[PDB]
Amino acid sequence: EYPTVSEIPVGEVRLYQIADGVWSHIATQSFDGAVYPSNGLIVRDGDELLLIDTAWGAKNTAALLAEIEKQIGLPVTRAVSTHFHDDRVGGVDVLRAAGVATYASPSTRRLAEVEGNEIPTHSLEGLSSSGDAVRFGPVELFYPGAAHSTDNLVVYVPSASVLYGGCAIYELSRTSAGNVADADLAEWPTSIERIQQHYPEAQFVIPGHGLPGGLDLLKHTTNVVKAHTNR
Numbered sequence: 374e375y376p377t378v379s380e381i382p383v384g385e386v387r388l389y390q391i392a393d394g395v396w397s398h399i400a401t402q403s404f405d406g407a408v409y410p411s412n413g414l415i416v417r418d419g420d421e422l423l424l425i426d427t428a429w430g431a432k433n434t435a436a437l438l439a440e441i442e443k444q445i446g447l448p449v450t451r452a453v454s455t456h457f458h459d460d461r462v463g464g465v466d467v468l469r470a471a472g473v474a475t476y477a478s479p480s481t482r483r484l485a486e487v488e489g490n491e492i493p494t495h496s497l498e499g500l501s502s503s504g505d506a507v508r509f510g511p512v513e514l515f516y517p518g519a520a521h522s523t524d525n526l527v528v529y530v531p532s533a534s535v536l537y538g539g540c541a542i543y544e545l546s547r548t549s550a551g552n553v554a555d556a557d558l559a560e561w562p563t564s565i566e567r568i569q570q571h572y573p574e575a576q577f578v579i580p581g582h583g584l585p586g587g588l589d590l591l592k593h594t595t596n597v598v599k600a601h602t603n604r
């Protein structure tokens with residue numbers, strides 16, 4: 374039932390209800406010949422919505438907001454980007470223009486600026502050291518340490534036991550390392566271990582790209598990362 378890349382044309386966005394008050398949003402983007410899916414999160418925040426990550430581009434994120442308005446009808450008041458790549462900050466300018474307060478760690482904002490990517494307006498304090506966690510409305514933000522990128526954050530929804538791993542966590546079907554140009558391969562396994570130690574009760578695990586699953590996705594990602602390390 375989870376939407377796949379074959380069922381979403383580039384420019385469209387699907388919402389998928391994980392639990393009460395928690396959705397993922399799925400978009401697709403063309404890159405280097407192929408088409409890839411990408412996940413973000415939507416968490417109900419009383420009568421407001423917290424958005425986790427853009428839909429990978431200005432056009433996709435405009436469609437994301439229209440699809441949220443259509444299906445959910447509650448306002449997106451804040452957005453958190455979980456690292457500096459375009460599938461997380463691409464569309465921040467659209468969000469800002471729509472009145473959404475955009476957020477990221479100073480680490481993410483710095484690396485976005487260096488890359489020439491869009492830059493969330495607000496800075497999330499208290500996430501500079503591995504193992505740091507802060508509350509942000511209905512979720513907890515956690516910095517496990519460098520992994521897919523030096524700045525990657527994970528998000529936990531305690532009310533629903535939903536762990537959003539972002540692109541530090543791979544889906545089961547992916548057996549080869551993907552975009553690791555900005556990764557810390559040496560620290561990635563240790564960072565995953567911090568996630569496991571902090572959220573052992575998670576019942577749903579959302580990867581940055583592809584099908585959700587359970588906590589198995591963490592060990593799977595470690596396996597793939599170590600295999601690539603010994604390439």
Ligand SMILES: O=C(O)c1ccc(-c2ccccc2)cc1CS
Pocket residue numbers: 404409410458459460540551552582
């Ligand atoms: O922003 C980028 O450069 C980027 C490009 C490609 C992917 C990708 C590749 C294969 C399968 C799923 C996703 C991801 C990212 C940002 S993490």
Ligand SMILES: [Zn+2]
Pocket residue numbers: 456458521522540552
């Ligand atoms: Zn990335």
Ligand SMILES: [Zn+2]
Pocket residue numbers: 474475494495
């Ligand atoms: Zn503001």
Ligand SMILES: [Zn+2]
Pocket residue numbers: 458460540581582
């Ligand atoms: Zn990604």
